[PDB]
């Protein structure tokens, strides 16, 4: 529980230090979620998954992907932006659109399922700008305190003595751009992959190949994007 336990317990060691400036804020978000339940409102993902993106090592991140907020439909969000459990079908529409761009860009077959944990295990941070949502109500937790947390995460990544490539999908993700100003960081921005915006420039954006080009141009290893 993020109200009750500290970052050293909740997240990976490097992330716990990176998020020190927002330690009180994370506890406050735990208190917000408690109050939602007390009032009879729900949230997604499950409490134990809210900080999941920060359970993969901070020092290993080479690319971050940033979306808006978790999937609104119960049974979809798992704490890793855009990912679903390997037994979910049909895929969420945003994810189907991501995978159509993945095939168009990379030439790979469609993935077997919607589980993006291989990316997380290969140095991709799968972050949402806001880390909870009320069911059925996209953006319902915008402005409730998560933005300071995810801002802190990006600044800390950007401060490391390492290259970083950010892929910012949609308007709320784009508000992290200022924090990526330093010369070791590069940002790719496009419209969000949901059907409401994907046809404004997400399709054809080739983010995966571009990210790898950028990493190689900074002396870093490219991501193996191939999903099984
Ligand atoms: Na999500």
Swiss-Prot record:
Keywords, alphabetical: Cytoplasm, DNA damage, DNA repair, Hydrolase
Disulfide bonds: none
Name assigned to this protein: Uracil-DNA glycosylase
Organism: Mycobacterium tuberculosis (strain ATCC 25618 / H37Rv)
Gene Ontology CC: cytoplasm
Keyword DNA repair appears in the UniProt entry: yes
Major subcellular location class: cytoplasm
GO molecular function terms attached to this record: uracil DNA N-glycosylase activity
